[PDB]
Design a binder for this molecule. Structure first.
Ligand SMILES: O=C(O)[C@@H](O)C(O)[C@H](O)C(=O)O
Ligand SMILES: O=C(O)[C@@H](O)C(O)[C@H](O)C(=O)O
Ligand SMILES: O=C(O)[C@@H](O)C(O)[C@H](O)C(=O)O
Ligand SMILES: [Cl-]
Ligand SMILES: [Zn+2]
Ligand SMILES: [Zn+2]
Ligand SMILES: [Zn+2]
Ligand SMILES: [Zn+2]
Lengths: 410, 410, 410, 142
């Protein structure tokens, strides 16, 4: 029956240890960059954008408040003055309950008590256990002063944390970044010649050696195109692709983000745009020895992206990114994906910026993926097919963990 | 439980008095422009387009028939020859049943009897009571000869009816409209100079003074862009925006309509197109002291529009407009909206052209919005949150009425 | 009640004989072009694309394998190593069960036994009976050497099979095709003059005379536009349209296919793109005496296509084509269509390349269409409308068969 | 000297050497501007170019150029181009120039002559007198 299947699917999904292949979390020993707290959860930029639609407090005043005050404002405006029904607000409550706290009391002061008596290491153990996350993939930007520090000091991340070499500044801001490269000893010239090419490669190789990243990544605008006689186009073609092939490291492209449409909002000021599939199509076909992990921001790019994955095996689609990370969208995306790709895709990643988010991000997404799995297994069951519990666990393992590790070559 | 919640949500939704912030209805005392009748309901242009896909009667012959004959044809073709399953046909039946008539008999002659013995004022009282609509926002075009009359005669609308200054002819047909402005005493010159600017402002100010509109509005094509060195671009930049800021009146933009692709169909001859978000993005960011009410016609513009609202608080999204006003779409739009905006948006408007439509428009939309509210409240309930009935009524009040009045400054 | 209605709708839908207005099947007497077998089902290009996302076997090696080996590989990779949850894999199982075979045993060798002891004619009788398909519309390309043979030999197709004149080579590859036309006696000149025009018309007329097609068809790219001073634009304008009007034959346009993005994949190497609606809009309005059957490949073209059908009665929308032929999409498309068009559209076609697919294609689509019909009938039932079983059968007959025959003029 | 012209191929294939006052120039219009049609002739001549632009197609096109350079000993390779000429470009012309012509020309130190601006056959019936002209962008040459 469907209910017998349902229980097996839900059990398999809930018990399957998750490999979160894209987050903004950091190994505890890396320091304060690792954000956690009910205060951090409430000041997540997703909620900053949401509170600004309600509060009379200016954005300037908001940025001038302490994190405690910002959190108090957001709690009052989005949870008390109006029901916390949005996905992000729902997420906060899910994290609280998961930690054993009681959302029924709406006692923020009591919730804060829970966090103030623990250490980073302890909360990490707690959260990964609760979220059943075995591996976390970080976003490591060698262009950030704070992050560069731990890496240069020789600090190695926790074994549960993996590095990913983020290259946004290099690919999207070369004109400014080239100068920093020079200061660091990478002799790139004013013009794109053999010298500049080799030094950029040396730069990538040095960080690959230092981080041992599972992949190199970059977020791109709606106008992204390739090939292109631009700094980005040339760097990707002459340096990134060749280096990635040599070390058999996949290239992750997060396409569709239009940066800073509302500067004053900070991290909450980015917009979205539909991109052309031409560049991705070209990269996949012309670089068969390169591997590509892709996720797009526009709802209107989702279906064609699935179709492109049917064309090229060197393409691995992943997650329901940012503005796509909402139940209604996650549901439609996951169903279209399983329908045209079976289980050859990575349904989700958390993109967690605050440690505790791993709880709600995976909880909310797992229940949806579980329902989709139940429908699909049931359809073949009605066709006379018999699926074993072991086959279910196998499929679930591919979706939440094995597809990623298998694609990156680990 | 979910069923206890369901009843509370449905009750709150059904009892919440509605402020319909965009319709094509008129205060009864305004005259015959106020359309009502089972005949008017059946000759709604939405059904004209639908009947032309079935009937062998030429469009010319149709326009030559009396309204009674047109209604008879549409009833026969869309209700008798085929089941009235489309949204618009379903709407007609909902209006009948709501009025106490019986769709089971399919007796159009009997239905007509009900309307012929009442007055405009009486039917208005009846419908607003049935639809539980407390306030109706009109669309008042000072460029229409018939409408200009009541306003110039000094006629004030019923207290339940509010004015909205529609400016399509001014913004999209200035080359022709400028001449009428001159005939009315507004000395606009051949070239866009201080004189033309001031006289256009004087024109807007005079009508704002006469109508006391809750907002100024315009429908725009898929190709809409801003800024732009065109009559529209210049009028918006040099006159509309400044005047709207001074009187703190919001600017409503209904984007995506491609006018007259099938001229012979009349009001049923408009098409749709996806628009670029650039112009809206620019307006929101560069005019922070101006308020904007926006609704778009293309299904492919919906998600990005929600994201843009997360960026700018001077943007208030509203309704599921025209071709978007169908269950399947209303559902997906409302869910995406609540998920990314919580309750900071106006889910719907009727766009009613015929008085009785208020019944089905709100009935059909309320049941969908109610189901979405139930899902979202249930999700936070499962997270341990407890929502009171008063909080539900508060949220419902914001969605169906308070968000609008609060945004316009009333 | 809804369950009483449900049974009537499901019964009507299941019993309604289907006219499949677009397939890639052939009358049995046409020869081996008629594909059938569990081996053919498994080597369907939809599954080739899917297996290439999993298998380590090179595409070259795959094309070098025998059909038996290809089928074995696909069965092992997509059904045994991972659960066959994708739509195409689900389809294979549905066909097996429908034929009386047992998917529970996963015994491919036993399944093969069933097919090896029957004749084409026998399997055709079997499948059409099982799929309850009364009429099959073929895709007949006079430019294919193999197909041209039966037609030139004077072979007439089975009475259950209808011809459709496919013109892709003529319209999209005229520069190469013109030479073949000359070799066949059609004196087209180097330049587009009266001579070339008349000879192209003569060519179309000759094949219309030989095939007696229900319609002429062509698949078009995302960049399709009209009018256009190109071979395609000129051929459509000066030859196709005039000839189609004269014989009152509709023109079918399948828009949105980007051919060969992955050449090595063969038939599995096509991609998709969103098209502009301008060309279709122009054709519908400027050629009122011509009939057009249209289906588009991009998910983002679906809603506007429905709106365009509301504008022009000479437009008949049909099916959920190729990448659109997935439950999640079929559901949303069918609901948007019924909501804005009632029953004036053709919900589906199979596009079957392998005989047995008629079973799963129609089985999977019928259950979805049935659920949509049940919702819509229920909505008007709740409005007080009473629908008779005969009206249901009538509506179902229009959707699955009469709308097509009525539109083509048969 | 157009190796794609039947009449012209003869003398070269027969081993005929031109008068000492006459020098050869390898004209490549058919190769660069009509590859889709020309590729088939290359195949018939033994140059195994594939359907897709890969190492194989590249090497065989180079072999073709090298063979004729060897046979003609041209002072330069030449081509006439349309007003819309651009470079780089993901087209047959753009790829052939980038992956074959330029490399081969550098190796043998042979210059590349480009005669830009001709819009072919605007008046077909006039034959050789049917070509028109158009202003080109300097971007590709630059
Ligand atoms: O929080 C987010 O998802 C964004 O602000 C970014 O971190 C984005 O996911 C990125 O990786 O660029
Ligand atoms: O009936 C309609 O919705 C349209 O014909 C128009 O009234 C549109 O809503 C508009 O306001 O321009
Ligand atoms: O199998 C398919 O649907 C495609 O490969 C084509 O046959 C397409 O449907 C077409 O008719 O061009
Ligand atoms: Cl789109
Ligand atoms: Zn991220
Ligand atoms: Zn309106
Ligand atoms: Zn949906
Ligand atoms: Zn087909």
């Amino acid at each position: 029956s469907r209910e017998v299947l349902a229980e097996k699917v839900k059990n398999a999904v809930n018990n399957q240890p998750v490999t979160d292949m894209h987050t903004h979390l950091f190994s505890p020993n890396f320091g304060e960059i690792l954000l956690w707290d009910i205060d951090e959860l409430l000041t997540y930029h997703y909620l900053v954008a949401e509170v600004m639609r309600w509060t009379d407090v200016s954005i300037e005043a908001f940025w001038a408040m302490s994190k405690r005050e910002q959190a108090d404002l957001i709690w009052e405006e989005l949870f008390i003055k109006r029901s916390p029904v949005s996905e992000a607000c729902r997420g906060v409550l899910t994290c609280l309950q998961g930690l054993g706290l009681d959302p029924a009391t709406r006692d923020l002061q009591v919730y804060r008590e829970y966090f103030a008596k623990k250490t980073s290491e302890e909360q990490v153990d707690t959260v990964l256990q609760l979220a059943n996350v075995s591996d976390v993939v970080m976003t490591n930007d060698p262009f950030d002063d704070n992050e560069r520090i731990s890496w240069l000091e020789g600090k190695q991340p926790d074994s549960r944390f993996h590095a990913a070499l983020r290259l946004d500044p290099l690919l999207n801001e070369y004109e400014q970044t080239k100068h920093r490269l020079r200061d660091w000893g990478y002799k790139v010239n004013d013009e794109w010649n053999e010298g500049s090419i080799q030094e950029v490669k040396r730069f990538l190789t040095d960080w690959i050696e230092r981080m041992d990243p599972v992949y190199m990544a970059v977020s791109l605008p709606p106008t992204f195109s390739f090939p292109e006689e631009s700094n980005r186009g040339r760097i990707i073609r002459d340096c990134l692709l060749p280096v990635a092939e040599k070390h058999n490291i996949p290239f992750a492209m997060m396409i569709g983000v239009k940066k800073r449409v509302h500067p004053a909002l900070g991290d909450a000021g980015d917009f979205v745009g539909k991109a052309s599939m031409d560049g991705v199509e070209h990269l996949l076909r012309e670089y068969p020895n390169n591997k590509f992990l892709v996720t797009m921001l526009s709802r209107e790019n989702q279906h064609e992206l699935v179709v492109l994955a049917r064309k090229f095996s060197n393409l691995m689609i992943f997650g329901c990114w940012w503005f796509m990370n909402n139940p209604e969208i996650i549901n439609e995306m996951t169903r279209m994906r399983m329908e045209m790709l079976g289980t050859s895709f990575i349904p989700q990643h958390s993109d967690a910026r605050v440690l505790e988010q791993l709880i709600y991000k995976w909880h909310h997404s797992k229940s949806i993926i579980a329902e989709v799995l139940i429908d699909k297994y049931d359809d073949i069951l009605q066709a006379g097919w018999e699926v074993t519990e072991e086959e279910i666990k196998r499929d679930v393992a591919d979706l939440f963990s094995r597809n990623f590790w298998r694609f990156v070559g680990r």
